[PDB]
C-alpha cells in the first residue's frame, strides 16, 4: 500500500489541495489549523466512505452546500495502481458520484461498478477498514496513551484490537502475549539491544507493561523520555504487526504533540535508522526539527483562507 496523490476540493480549509506522496518518509509539516489534519481525514474518508471516520458527519460531505466536494486518491497495492474518486455535487447539480479504477497502460478502467456499495465491498477485499484504521493509521494520542498508565494502555489496546467466554479470554491472553514478543523484538531493535524483552500482563481492565533490565521487571518509570517514546512506538507498531502481519504503510498523525530535545532526538534516530525500512511512511507534525530525518517534506499552511501546499523536498 503506497499513496501517490490526494486531491481534495471544498472540504474544510481545502479549496483545491493536491499532495503528492513518494517513497520513504513523507513529512507533512504545518501549524495547527493549517489543514494538515483534515488532509488525513480526507484520505481516510476517500478510502472508506461511507464508513465512520472519527466523528466526521456524512452531512459535512453531502450537505455543507455550494461548490462540489471532491476527493481523488491514487495509490498502489500489489503491483496495481488504483484510483478512487468521490464527488459530492452541489451548487445547482446534486447527488453523489463514486468510482474506483485501476490503471491499464494509460487508461483508467473501472475495477467495479461505480457505486459506493461496490467500491466498499472491493476495498474490504483489498485492504479492510479495520486494518487501515488500526494498523496503518496511528491516531494522535495513542503513543502517549500507551505510556500514560496501565488503564489507558488497556483502553488503547481495546480500541486498536477491536465455552465462548473461555474462547474470548484465551484470545485476549494470546493477543497480549504475541504483542509482547513483537514489541520485544522492535524495542530491542530501537534501543540497540539495551533492553531485549518487553513484558505485557493483562490484569483486570489493565495492561501491565514492564521493561526488562537485568532480568528484572522494571516499571516504565525507570525509563528516560527517549526510551519512553521508543517503547510506546514499539508497542504501538507491535500492535499494527499483530493486526496486519506486516507494515508496508505507516501513517503517524502527530506522534509527538509535545516533544523535548531528548524525545525529538530519539524519534529522529528512530526515523533515520529504523522507520526508513518501511516502504512508505507519512508523518504529520508541527515540528520543523523533524525535517532532517525525512526523505520528502511538504509544508501545509493557511494562505488567503485556504490550505496551501509547498513542496520543500
Curated annotation (Swiss-Prot):
InterPro entries: ATPase_AAA_core, P-loop_NTPase, Rad50/SbcC_AAA, Rad50_ATPase_archaeal, Zn_hook_RAD50. SUPFAM superfamilies: P-loop containing nucleoside triphosphate hydrolases (SSF52540), Rad50 coiled-coil Zn hook (SSF75712). Disulfide bonds: none annotated. It holds the Pfam family Rad50_zn_hook. Transmembrane segments: none annotated. ATP binds at residues 12, 32-38, 60-64, 140, 194-195, 222-227. Binding of ATP induces a closed, compact conformation of the Rad50/Mre11 complex. ATP hydrolysis opens the complex. The two conserved Cys that bind zinc constitute the zinc-hook, which separates the large intramolecular coiled coil regions. The 2 Cys residues coordinate one molecule of zinc with the help of the 2 Cys residues of the zinc-hook of another Rad50 molecule, thereby forming a V-shaped homodimer. Homodimer. Forms a heterotetramer composed of two Mre11 subunits and two Rad50 subunits. Homodimerization is promoted by ATP binding. NCBIfam families: PRK03918.1 (NF003034). PANTHER family: ABC TRANSPORTER ABCH.3 (PTHR32114:SF2). Part of the Rad50/Mre11 complex, which is involved in the early steps of DNA double-strand break (DSB) repair. The complex may facilitate opening of the processed DNA ends to aid in the recruitment of HerA and NurA. Rad50 controls the balance between DNA end bridging and DNA resection via ATP-dependent structural rearrangements of the Rad50/Mre11 complex. The ATP-bound conformation promotes DNA end binding and end tethering, and alters Mre11 nuclease activity. ATP hydrolysis promotes both Mre11 activity as well as HerA/NurA activity. Also has reversible adenylate kinase activity. Belongs to the SMC family. RAD50 subfamily. This is DNA double-strand break repair Rad50 ATPase. It comes from Pyrococcus furiosus (strain ATCC 43587 / DSM 3638 / JCM 8422 / Vc1).
Amino acid at each position: 500500500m503506497k499513496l501517490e496523490r490526494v486531491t481534495v476540493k471544498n472540504f474544510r480549509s481545502h479549496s483545491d489541495t493536491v499532495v503528492e506522496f513518494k517513497e520513504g518518509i513523507n513529512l507533512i509539516i504545518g501549524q495547527n489549523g493549517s489543514g494538515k489534519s483534515s488532509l488525513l481525514d480526507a484520505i481516510l474518508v476517500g478510502l472508506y466512505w461511507p464508513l465512520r471516520i472519527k466523528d466526521i458527519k456524512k452531512d459535512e460531505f453531502t450537505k455543507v452546500g455550494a461548490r462540489d466536494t471532491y476527493i481523488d486518491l491514487i495509490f498502489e497495492k500489489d503491483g496495481t495502481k488504483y484510483r478512487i474518486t468521490r464527488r459530492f455535487l452541489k451548487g445547482y447539480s446534486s447527488g453523489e458520484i463514486h468510482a474506483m479504477k485501476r490503471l491499464v497502460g494509460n487508461e483508467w478502467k473501472h475495477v467495479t461498478e461505480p457505486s459506493s456499495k461496490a467500491i466498499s465491498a472491493f476495498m474490504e477485499k483489498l485492504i479492510p477498514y479495520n486494518i487501515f484504521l488500526n494498523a496503518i493509521y496511528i491516531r494522535q494520542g495513542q503513543i502517549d496513551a500507551i505510556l500514560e498508565s496501565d488503564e489507558a494502555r488497556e483502553k488503547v489496546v481495546r480500541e486498536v484490537l477491536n465455552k465462548v467466554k473461555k474462547y474470548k479470554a484465551l484470545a485476549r491472553e494470546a493477543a497480549l502475549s504475541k504483542i509482547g514478543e513483537l514489541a520485544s523484538e522492535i524495542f530491542a531493535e530501537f534501543t540497540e539491544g539495551k533492553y531485549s524483552e518487553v513484558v505485557v500482563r493483562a490484569e483486570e481492565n489493565k495492561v501491565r507493561l514492564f521493561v526488562v533490565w537485568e532480568g528484572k521487571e522494571r516499571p516504565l518509570t525507570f525509563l528516560s523520555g527517549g526510551e519512553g517514546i521508543a517503547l510506546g512506538l514499539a508497542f504501538r507498531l507491535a500492535m499494527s504487526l499483530y493486526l496486519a502481519g506486516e507494515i508496508s504503510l505507516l501513517i503517524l498523525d502527530e506522534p509527538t504533540p509535545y516533544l523535548d530535545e531528548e524525545r525529538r532526538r530519539k524519534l529522529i534516530t528512530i526515523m533515520e535508522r529504523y522507520l526508513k525500512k518501511i516502504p512508505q511512511v507519512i508523518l504529520v507534525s508541527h515540528d520543523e526539527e523533524l525535517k532532517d530525518a525525512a526523505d520528502h517534506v511538504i509544508r501545509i499552511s493557511l494562505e488567503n483562507g485556504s490550505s496551501k501546499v509547498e513542496v520543500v523536498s
